[PDB]
Amino acid sequence: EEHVIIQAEFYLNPDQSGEFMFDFDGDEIFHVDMAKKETVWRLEEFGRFASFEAQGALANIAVDKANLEIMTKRSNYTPITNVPPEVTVLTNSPVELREPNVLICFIDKFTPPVVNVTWLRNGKPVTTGVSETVFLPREDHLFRKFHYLPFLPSTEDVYDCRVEHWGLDEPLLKHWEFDT
Amino acid sequence: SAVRLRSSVPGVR
């Protein structure tokens, strides 16, 4: 195949979280903000060329919720087995002192799709300028997710991405600091 | 141009 486009949905109990997104070759085209009932394009340019009626996603998620009820009963209430994430931290670009860069925390191969992620700078939580993706589907039907932190590289700062997941006994910290 | 969804189907109760 040359390309694959997937409309991927999930609903999770008891959290009552439901997601709806389109994927092209492993990248997100858009997702629907369920609470705001709005289409969120992954790159802003996408929305100048295409549209999506967010309301339609809500109806599908409602069906998925009802289907989850049915399937939970059919399975004799067999719950999901937690699969803890693999976590990697990297930069967007080669690091140069005081040249703006971005730390990426890649959280991969996990389920259920619930995680707490914190960026730490010198052991302290930081939130200025941070961003993140929704939960993205994998071909093995686990999930992946990205978190981002713009930063100005210095010899004085160290960073960690701290990830909490029910499959982990303790939070996972992955470190980054300026090399040499 | 509008992206179209594919509906999800209610299962048997």
């Binding site: 997937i6 092209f24 085209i29 990426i104 389920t111 | 048997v12």
Partner: protein, 190 residues
């Protein structure tokens, strides 16, 4: 929070071969990670994947209207959506930025690793090769592999283990669909 979790997933998949010349549609339902029922356009009806999906396959297959919707999906859904998004997905081309810098395998030793950092490209298909004085070096090459950045760009680091000698010129060469000829970056010792 130790409460048990229960997950339903649905993936409506469109697979494209040679543009939209050949298209396959899969309608897939999952409980946790277990696919339990699917419609494959190659077949034209729902089929249970596990015992859990048998009731749905029979029920859904009894709905002629539903089946005709699904049988038309390769056209009304897959080919349609391909047309809508192709200009910024299928046709997306972003050329790589290429940087070469030296590194060390062990702290005490002289620079003995050359890193070719290839950043920001799309799509994922890429070929990176190392050359020493115009001759390709295939030994001592290790890579991160292809890394998705999550923002419609990729990166990869391709390292060459080598002991640079004075006078030598190393070249990292990159081929990619966004390029019309190989992109090369040289590094000279020292």
């Amino acid at each position: 929070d130790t409460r048990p979790r229960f997950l339903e997933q649905v993936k409506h998949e469109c697979h494209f071969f040679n543009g939209t010349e050949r298209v396959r549609f899969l309608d897939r339902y999952f409980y946790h990670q277990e696919e339990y029922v699917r419609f494959d356009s190659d077949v034209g009806e729902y089929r249970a994947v596990t015992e859990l999906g048998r009731p749905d396959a029979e029920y859904w297959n009894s709905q002629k209207d539903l089946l005709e919707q699904r049988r038309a999906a390769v056209d009304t859904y897959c080919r349609h959506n391909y047309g809508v998004v192709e200009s910024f997905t299928v046709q997306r081309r972003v050329y790589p930025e290429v940087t070469v810098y030296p590194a060390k395998t062990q702290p005490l030793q002289h620079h003995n690793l050359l890193v070719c950092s290839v950043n920001g490209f799309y799509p994922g298909s890429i070929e990176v090769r190392w050359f020493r004085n115009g001759q390709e070096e295939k030994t001592g090459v290790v890579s991160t592999g292809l890394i998705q950045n999550g923002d419609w760009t990729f990166q990869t680091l391709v390292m060459l283990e080598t002991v640079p000698r004075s006078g030598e010129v190393y070249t990292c060469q990159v081929e990619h669909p966004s390029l019309t000829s190989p992109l090369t970056v040289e590094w000279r010792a020292t």
